[PDB]
């Protein structure tokens, strides 16, 4: 199964030990899959669009 995890703090993402690997779909869809399971920190802030 699958489950989406969505943040509740607005800010900058910072990897920690996460090693993304780019898997390119035949249409060019570069999906980032983590080879090394780590942490995705969110450093809080005010994000402006």
Structure-block tokens of residue 47: 């994000």
Picking from 8, 2, 3, 14, the residue whose alpha carbon sits closest to that of residue 42 is: 14
Euclidean distance between CA atoms 44 and 13, whole angstroms = 9
Q: How far does the chain reach from its first CA to its final CA, in angstroms?
A: 33
CA distance linking residue 26 with residue 44, whole number of Å: 36
- Contact indicator for 14, 7 with CB cutoff of 8 Å: no
Tell me how far apart the alpha carbons of residues 33 and 20 are, in angstroms, rounded to a whole number: 5
d(CA 22, CA 38): 17
10 vs 18, 32, 36, 41, 45, CA distance in Å? Answer: 20, 21, 25, 11, 6
Parallel, antiparallel or unpaired: strands 11-16 and 19-24: unpaired
SS (H, E, C) 28-45: CCEEEEEEECCEEEEEEC
């Amino acid at each position: 199964a699958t489950k989406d995890v969505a943040t509740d703090l607005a800010g900058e993402i910072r990897f920690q030990d996460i090693v993304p690997e780019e898997k390119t779909d035949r249409q060019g869809n570069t999906t980032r899959i983590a080879q090394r399971g780590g942490l995705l920190w969110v450093l809080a802030g005010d994000v402006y669009n």
